[PDB]
Design a protein around this ligand. Structure first.
Ligand SMILES: [Ca+2]
Ligand SMILES: [Ca+2]
Ligand SMILES: [Cl-]
Ligand SMILES: [Cl-]
Ligand SMILES: [Cl-]
Ligand SMILES: [Cl-]
Ligand SMILES: [Cl-]
Ligand SMILES: [Cl-]
Ligand SMILES: [Cl-]
Ligand SMILES: [Cl-]
Ligand SMILES: [Mg+2]
Ligand SMILES: [Mg+2]
Lengths: 199, 199
């Protein structure tokens, strides 16, 4: 089988409130203002797809949120994002591979050239046959073209593919192509799914 | 009672391997070299006590580890340190206070002026009556003077004080003054200690 895993809130817990905390720490802007002004629109989509530079992405968010930061300062806080591995999921991924299943990661990424990001973590790279990243592809979930890129490059049909993601639009985008798509509700979805099938 | 909690590996999980990962990411220096060259000696003690500047501390570690980083780049990776709250411990701290016990934090800190650090987290500040930090005091655990500073400033005797820390030297330093010192072996030590006594 081909197994596709989302990264954010599937393989790792991730929390961008830490970043807002760090920008609040530096700017003294009340956290609540940053929480209110921080939202993922067009500049995110473009950055995810590599259509605008890190600097332009920084500039757009700083304009939205009235952040008087240099690019370096932006990056410095961006670096602070909370990321914890889910070791249960990592172990399952390793197990699937040694049973000759194909295991890959599919992630919309706002990594910057100056930051250390989950897709760069040795434990996540060593757990996957391949990692597919939006910025490299010029595509993002839930666009059909990104799922198709993966089926095509891995050589599997929709019906031989299982996809895990916590975002319901992402799940819909995959379903449209006949991928078996598992909504990740929380940390039990994936251990359950694989309970009997592994151990 | 006066309850004193260590921060690192007591209230929060903390992992500086994330920092080494980030410096490896930037420098391309193999992680294993950084792991081998990274050790907490005199420059740490001094920085903890506020005796040398952030820059000097950076300069010393970069010299030790052959890190060709600016101060900004050092800080940028330092910012990456893994920190997760232990919500069990945070809740216990809140509970102790509302029962009229005094609850404080005692931490040797290598915060920089440019970073967002656990002692600055709203959830940790809001959980404690007071937070005692090495850099502010010019003292560090396990020196007797730092424990004495806390007893003196809070107005409690050793025998009315309970201290939690995972470092055995820190625990010894407290014991020497007749503080009740609880070695934190793992994440159960503290929930157990308070199981019956709270709920
Ligand atoms: Ca990087
Ligand atoms: Ca700060
Ligand atoms: Cl992701
Ligand atoms: Cl202020
Ligand atoms: Cl994603
Ligand atoms: Cl498309
Ligand atoms: Cl600490
Ligand atoms: Cl390289
Ligand atoms: Cl400490
Ligand atoms: Cl002393
Ligand atoms: Mg996700
Ligand atoms: Mg500790």
């Amino acid at each position: 089988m081909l197994y596709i895993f989302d990264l954010g809130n599937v393989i790792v817990d991730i929390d961008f409130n830490r970043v807002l905390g760090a920008w609040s720490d530096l700017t003294r802007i009340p956290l609540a203002s940053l929480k209110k002004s921080f939202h993922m629109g067009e500049a995110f989509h473009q950055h995810e797809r590599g259509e605008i530079s890190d600097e332009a992405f920084a500039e757009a968010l700083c304009h939205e949120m009235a952040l008087p930061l240099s690019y370096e300062q932006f990056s410095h806080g961006w670096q602070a994002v909370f990321v914890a591995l889910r070791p249960e999921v990592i172990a399952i991924m390793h197990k699937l591979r040694e049973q000759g299943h194909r295991v890959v990661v599919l992630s919309n990424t706002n990594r910057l050239h100056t930051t250390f990001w989950p897709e760069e973590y040795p434990e996540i790279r060593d757990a996957a046959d391949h990692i597919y990243l939006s910025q490299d592809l010029g595509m993002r979930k839930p666009e059909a073209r990104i799922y198709q890129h993966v089926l095509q490059a891995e050589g599997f049909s929709p019906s031989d593919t299982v996809f895990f993601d916590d975002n319901a639009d992402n799940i819909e985008g995959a379903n449209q192509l006949g991928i078996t798509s598992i909504l990740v509700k929380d940390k039990t979805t994936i251990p359950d799914y694989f309970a009997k099938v592994l151990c």
